[PDB]
Design a binder for these strands. Structure first.
Lengths: 140, 103, 59
RNA sequence: UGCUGAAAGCAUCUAAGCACGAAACUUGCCCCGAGAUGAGUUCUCCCUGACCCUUUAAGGGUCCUGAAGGAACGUUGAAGA
RNA sequence: UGUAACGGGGCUAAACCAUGCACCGAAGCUGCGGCAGCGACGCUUAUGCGUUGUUGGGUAGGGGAGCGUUCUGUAAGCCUG
RNA sequence: GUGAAGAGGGAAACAACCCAGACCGCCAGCUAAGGUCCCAAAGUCAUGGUUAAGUGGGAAACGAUGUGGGAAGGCCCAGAC
RNA sequence: CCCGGCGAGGGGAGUGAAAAAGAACCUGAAACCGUGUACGUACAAGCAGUGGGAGCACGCUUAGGCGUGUGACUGCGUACC
């Protein structure tokens, strides 16, 4: 009789080339969360257990639109609080597809819970039509 | 048939379900009263021209049958947090449903 | 969940949940759209008609 | 440090734009590294005989002139917790 | 002593102020169940059931009400090898 | 203003300190004051200015050929810049 | 009677209602334990939850959403006095 819909594992994945990369980046990196969860595919389980498959194409184009770009740092200090620090900035690090300047969903599923199983389902292969290493069947 | 009933129950838009209503203030254990209180029930909800709500009242009444919910199902919780210690306390209520629309 | 079925495709038609609802509520018999609109999950192919009813002035 | 040259006929490294630069940021520097569970892979080498059991895409289970091989196999040792 | 003043991520207008509008929406009044206290009613009255009003977190005090391992008693009374 | 023998929704996580606010139920409705692109569950709505700085969640003693809205005024085509 | 250390303990007989009366003589749970039917599972967070539910060791049903517990997802939090 239930209104609920578990597993669902995963019933709606919408295989899409996220061309919005750079040319309206900071509008839709903010809402890649609400895409994996929702806004079209919201019709089953828009909060719990689910998975998605969005198609990556480029990475070093962050665009980002503010003074922030050449003076905002990122920090990991991965061992013993670092001590000796680091100071590269956003349009200088984005040259490399790493872990903090390119996924976006890092900051929107922001701890690890619910995110703990969906790290590289989007592949993060980067290099345009020369690098379509994604799904062989027909992506949108 | 697609009820217009809502008081303690407005899930109940299903044709049979089963789904709950109220047990009301007075006698609600008597089975039936055989009379019919309603006819603003549906129209396009049952036909080849579709609507999501109450536009019509199509010839099919709803009988007064509050049924036989007599064994005491699950009802009660308690109170403790700080020194708030109540562990009987709970004056009773319950829910019930219709006897099965013969139409 | 339940409102998903009246916004996911209806978005590209501009019929946006929060902003449609002022138009709709101008009719005093059309109040309870909350749960009763959920039939839209299977009903799509003849549910497409529903928004014609007052469009002249509604849209 | 100054180049053209203006904001404001002036004066001028900046405004629009350039070219270099240091324990410094970076960086195939030096040293380990998916044990970074994102779970990727090149290079090179190696296995193809018969079948059974239903509660079937879930599997469960046998038997092949016994192969080349494997660690205890006799003392250790170079590391021996 | 790990950038650590909204919890983030900083958003070039999504804002910042004024003017329209409908969604979210604590235990917050509503659906409609049950009802302990002190009051008013229809009558009843040994008294009580419903209507009507005030309303239902409870260590200082005073009200005033439920039940037991069984002892001393209900009972050669009825119960059970 | 009822503070705890009051619990947890308020104004930041200043149990007290603005004050009326919970018995106990729902696959049911919503009230304010925080907001309302987000982890986060409703408009990239319509309708008017400002703003072009990363301004918003660091001001106090001053500054300044960058601009913005308003009403008076000075100077100027017998020639003021 | 049978094994083993010319032992300890059991596997059947058996006085016996009984060895769950067997001389570490009480007809008898408690602090803690061993092999197992299935779980969750060698990326761990926050009194180890009651929720909300997939299907799993097993069980009933002329099909009828239930009789069963560690508890994938995560939500709620601070149980004391």
């Amino acid at each position: 009789m239930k209104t609920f819909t578990a597993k669902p594992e995963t019933v709606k994945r919408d295989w899409y080339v996220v061309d919005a990369t750079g040319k309206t980046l900071g509008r839709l990196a903010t809402e890649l969360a609400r895409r994996l969860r929702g806004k079209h595919k919201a019709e089953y389980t828009p909060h719990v257990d689910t998975g998605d498959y969005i198609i990556v194409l480029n990475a070093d184009k962050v665009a980002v639109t503010g003074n922030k770009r050449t003076d905002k740092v990122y920090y990991h200090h991965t061992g013993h609080i670092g001590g000796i620090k680091q100071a590269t900035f956003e349009e200088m690090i984005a040259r490399r597809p790493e872990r903090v300047i390119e996924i976006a969903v890092k900051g929107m599923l922001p701890k690890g819970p619910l995110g703990r199983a969906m790290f590289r389902k989007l592949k993060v292969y980067a290099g345009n039509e020369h690098n379509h290493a994604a799904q062989q069947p027909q992506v949108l | 048939m697609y009820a217009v009933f809502q008081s303690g129950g407005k899930q109940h838009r299903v044709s049979e379900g089963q789904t709950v209503r109220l047990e009301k203030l007075d006698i609600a254990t008597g089975e039936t009263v055989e009379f019919a209180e309603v006819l603003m029930i549906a129209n396009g909800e049952e036909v080849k021209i579709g609507v999501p709500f109450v536009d019509g009242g199509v010839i099919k009444a709803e009988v007064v049958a509050h049924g036989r919910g007599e064994k005491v199902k699950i009802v009660k919780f308690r109170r403790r947090k700080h020194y708030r210690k109540q562990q009987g306390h709970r004056q009773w209520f319950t829910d019930v449903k219709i006897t099965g629309i013969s139409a | 969940l339940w409102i998903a079925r009246i916004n996911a495709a209806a978005r590209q038609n501009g019929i946006s949940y929060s902003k449609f609802i002022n138009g709709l509520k101008k009719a005093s018999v059309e109040i309870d759209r909350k749960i009763l609109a959920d039939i839209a999950v299977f009903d799509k192919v003849a549910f497409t008609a529903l928004v014609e009813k007052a469009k002249a002035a509604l849209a």
